[PDB]
Amino acid sequence: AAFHGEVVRPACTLAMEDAWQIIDMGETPVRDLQNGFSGPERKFSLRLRNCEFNSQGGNLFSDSRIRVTFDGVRGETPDKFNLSGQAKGINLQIADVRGNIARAGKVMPAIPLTGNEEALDYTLRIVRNGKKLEAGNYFAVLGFRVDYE
Amino acid sequence: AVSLDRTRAVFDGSEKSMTLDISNDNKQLPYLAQAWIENENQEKIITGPVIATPPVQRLEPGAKSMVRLSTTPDISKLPQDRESLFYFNLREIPPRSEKANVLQIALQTKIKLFYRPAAIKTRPNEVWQDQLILNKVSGGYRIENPTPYYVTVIGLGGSEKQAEEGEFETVMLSPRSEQTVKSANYNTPYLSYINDYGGRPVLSFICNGSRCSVKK
Ligand SMILES: O=C(O)[C@@H]1CSc2c(C3CC3)c(Cc3cccc4ccccc34)c(CN3CCOCC3)c(=O)n21
Ligand SMILES: [Co+2]
């Protein structure tokens, strides 16, 4: 069509496996934590759709056309997030595919993506927060903020 | 789940309001969407001079809706000869799962919102970005934006392909301002920028000594 109305790039819609946009963390990893380790790793994939995320040379994330940030309550260190619920002695850690740890409210570094997929991949794990462990149920809502250039 | 229909918004100062379409792309679950404005410092604002309504709404699975931006009389206090920058924010509230041991993710979308006064109103596809000037300096370029508009620069290389695909730290030039950018020297610089529609055109520059301007 030579002649037509304005067509603009839409912002990305976020798609996950789970309809609630939830990652199951599993039972509090008490044994693992007491041996001085973190809990087991939990993969989560965010797909960013409808924004033509991929282009011939790269993608919006790796090119710094969008900036992403995890928003939440800082835990014990800048590298940790706070958790709600009855459990005690625990924080969450989020890492990217090169092992860069997310800090609450700080922009993730632009890195090139793997399996040239349309997806952002993150890893979470439960870590100690220095307080005494009381096993129990935990939860968190994390903001995932996409700032558009 | 909740998405916005654009990656930047231009508010035409000759009108009193505009709308942005939003959508719940989750076809299974209702999501709430909160909408608010922030000022150029990304500090929140609520009484003016631009407001977003409704500030919260419920979207049924698959539903389409909108958010409206309007101006208050205090809008007249902004400069009339240059753009002002705000941010529009759209943050979903996912439905609560009462599931044990879960992490729930909530998208927030933050876009630039350019208030463009009536006196500097533009036509469809108008290009002012070709008025940029590059100046070579130690370690890079001082880029001058003499225009009344914000200009977002996302590429700078020695060919078109380098402008579009080369590594470059995105930088936004305020109206009538200049900024220094770390860069290799390029014989014939190409510069990529984002336009009002979210497209990424490229401009070809020619240098006379340290000063570079767009090929007429
Ligand atoms: O509280 C909760 O668990 C959830 C998450 S936040 C929230 C808000 C909202 C964050 C404050 C509102 C308030 C709210 C929601 C949608 C549209 C609105 C329009 C105007 C005013 C309020 C609206 C709620 C009220 N409802 C909505 C209809 O079902 C009964 C419970 C609500 O449950 N919730
Ligand atoms: Co066309």
Dump the DSSP string for chain B.
-EEES-SEEEEETTSSEEEEEEEE--SSS-EEEEEEEE-TTS-EESSSSEEEE-SEEEE-TT-EEEEEEEE-GGGGGS-SSS-EEEEEEEEEEPPPP--TTEEEEEEEEEEEEEEE-GGG---TT---GGG-EEEEETTEEEEEE-SSS-EEEEEEESSHHHHHHS----EEEPTTEEEEEE----SS-EEEEE-TTS---EEEEEEETTEEEE--
Q: How was this model experimentally determined?
A: X-ray
* Tokens (6 digits) for B174: 């305020």
CATH of domain B122-213: 2.60.40.10
**Structural domains of chain A in order of their starting residue, each with its CATH number:** 12-149 (2.60.40.1090)
Ligand index nearest the alpha carbon of residue A1: 2
Q: Does domain B1-121 have CATH number 2.60.40.10?
A: yes
- Residue B199 φ then ψ, to 5°: -90, 160
SS (H, E, C) A8-71: CCCCCEEECCCCCCEEECCCCCHHHHHCCCCCCCEEEEEEEECCCCECCCCECCCCCCEEEEEE
For residue B61, is the peptide bond before it cis, meaning its omega torsion is within 30 degrees of 0?
no
* Tokens (6 digits) for B132: 């940029």
Q: What are B46-51's contacts with CB under 8 Å, separation 24+?
A: B47/B72, B48/B72, B48/B74, B48/B75, B49/B74, B49/B75, B49/B77, B49/B78, B50/B11, B50/B75, B50/B86, B50/B113, B50/B115
- Taking the Cβ of residue A5 and every Cβ of chain B, the question of whether any pair is shorter than 8 Å is answered with no
Q: CB within 8 A of A51, min separation 6: which ones?
A: A9, A10, A11, A12, A13, A60, B7
From the list A63, A138, A146, which residue is nearest B110 (CB)? A146
Resolution (A): 2.4
Indicate the Cα dihedral angle B34, B36, B41, B47, nearest 10°.
-140
Query: At A78, which helix (H) or strand (E)?
Result: none
Cite the residue boundaries of each domain of chain B with CATH code 2.60.40.10.
Answer: 1-121, 122-213
What would you report as the CA-atom Rg of chain A, rounded to the nearest whole angstrom?
Answer: 18
- Taking the Cβ of residue A65 and every Cβ of chain B, the question of whether any pair is shorter than 8 Å is answered with yes
For a mutational test of ligand 1's pocket, the pick from B22, B31, B58, B97, i.e. the residue with the most ligand atoms closer than 8 A to its C-beta, is B58
